[PDB]
UniProtKB/Swiss-Prot annotation, chain D:
It comes from the Eukaryota. Expressed in brain (at protein level). It is found in: Cytoplasmic vesicle, Clathrin-coated vesicle membrane. V-ATPase is a heteromultimeric enzyme made up of two complexes: the ATP-hydrolytic V1 complex and the proton translocation V0 complex. The V1 complex consists of three catalytic AB heterodimers that form a heterohexamer, three peripheral stalks each consisting of EG heterodimers, one central rotor including subunits D and F, and the regulatory subunits C and H. The proton translocation complex V0 consists of the proton transport subunit a, a ring of proteolipid subunits c9c'', rotary subunit d, subunits e and f, and the accessory subunits ATP6AP1/Ac45 and ATP6AP2/PRR. Interacts with AP2M1. Subunit of the V1 complex of vacuolar(H+)-ATPase (V-ATPase), a multisubunit enzyme composed of a peripheral complex (V1) that hydrolyzes ATP and a membrane integral complex (V0) that translocates protons. V-ATPase is responsible for acidifying and maintaining the pH of intracellular compartments and in some cell types, is targeted to the plasma membrane, where it is responsible for acidifying the extracellular environment. Subunit H is essential for V-ATPase activity, but not for the assembly of the complex. Belongs to the V-ATPase H subunit family. This is V-type proton ATPase subunit H.
């Protein structure tokens, strides 16, 4: 930023963006593991079928 | 039934291998706004 | 059991509708050896 | 065969039960007339109300996707081998016709528009990259207007699919939702109890921030 009091707007801009970027990475992991809670179930019959 | 499972874990995993990089580039941006502020002061 | 077996060459007549389901019930039994009726055919066009 | 009888029998559950026999197709003569009856039902109908027999028949049932693998088989009757190409030029035209900006406008303005192939098609989102811009940003401001005042027990996921696909194809559209506050909306609706609206809102907020 090269200036004072505009990095304060920047560092609080990355502070809220990381929060919205970590709240999706915690939500996609337990959704992908909710896929493999159901889709990894019954794979052996699907190989046989 | 299978194209749902095929396209989900193909879209999510390539999202995860891209959104981790977008996240790991941003935390080293959040620290170098924090480190140079106290260094300037 | 000191001799081998007694086979048959039985001939199936499977209709159009019951062509999957009878061979499927032949798969659970599993004492049937299928002979290749069409040897001189390429890997496609096999219906 | 008579066109006056086509709109007389349409006050019934005719085509969806006729699609439920087409999935069995065990006798191979039961479905050989059903593919022929659908051509006779549409071609011998001199009106424009075959679009009602598009919105009921094939875009809401598993019969449009069944025409492809019925073509890929080696059918012997020459009247069915011409019937599969006659229904594809019919139905291919129908998918194309189905996707149009005006129709989409009705869907988010007249509202209550569901999981039709107007959202699922890439050919929809391919052309209208600036249609959300051409309505002076109000087109981006009326989809979210229905998302925030209403609970939408089923259709909440549909407009969340509308925003997630649009910000993928247009990178400047993410700044519109950042001034609008619709980013906070999809962070709330992703915690909802229904797995159909929770996943698509999860699919939307992972598409809003693809590059930062």
């Amino acid at each position: 930023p090269e200036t004072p009091q505009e990095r304060k707007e920047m560092a609080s801009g990355v502070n809220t963006r990381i929060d919205d970027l970590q709240m999706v990475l915690n939500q996609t992991e337990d959704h992908r593991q909710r896929v493999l809670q159901a889709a990894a179930k019954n794979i052996r019959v699907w190989f046989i079928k | 039934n299978f194209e749902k499972i095929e396209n989900e874990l193909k879209e999510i995993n390539t999202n995860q291998e891209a959104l981790k990089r977008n996240f790991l580039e941003l935390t080293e941006l959040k620290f170098i706004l924090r480190k140079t502020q106290q260094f300037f002061d | 059991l000191f001799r081998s077996e007694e086979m048959t060459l039985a001939q199936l007549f499977l209709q159009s509708e019951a062509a999957y389901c009878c061979v499927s019930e032949l798969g659970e039994l599993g004492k049937v050896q299928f002979r290749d009726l069409n040897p001189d055919v390429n890997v496609f066009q096999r219906k | 065969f008579s066109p006056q009888m086509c709109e007389h029998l349409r006050r019934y559950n005719i085509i969806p039960v006729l699609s439920d026999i087409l999935q069995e197709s065990v006798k191979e003569k039961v479905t050989r007339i059903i593919l022929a009856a659908f051509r006779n039902f549409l071609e011998k109908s001199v009106e424009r109300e075959t679009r009602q027999e598009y919105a009921l028949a094939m875009i809401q049932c598993k019969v449009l996707k069944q025409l492809e693998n019925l073509e890929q088989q080696k059918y012997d009757d020459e009247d069915i081998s011409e019937d599969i190409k006659f229904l594809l030029e019919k139905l291919g035209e129908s998918v194309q016709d189905l996707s149009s900006f005006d129709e989409y406008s009705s869907e988010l303005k007249s509202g209550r528009l569901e999981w039709s192939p107007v959202h699922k098609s890439e050919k929809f989102w391919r052309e209208n990259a600036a249609r959300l811009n051409e309505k002076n940003y109000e087109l981006l401001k009326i989809l979210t207007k229905l998302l925030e005042v209403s609970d939408d027990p089923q259709v909440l996921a549909v407009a969340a699919h509308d925003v997630g696909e649009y910000v993928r194809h247009y990178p400047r559209g993410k700044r519109v939702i950042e001034q609008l506050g619709g980013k906070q909306l999809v962070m709330n609706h992703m915690h909802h109890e229904d797995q159909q609206v929770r996943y698509n809102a999860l699919l939307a907020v992972q598409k809003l921030m693809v590059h930062n």
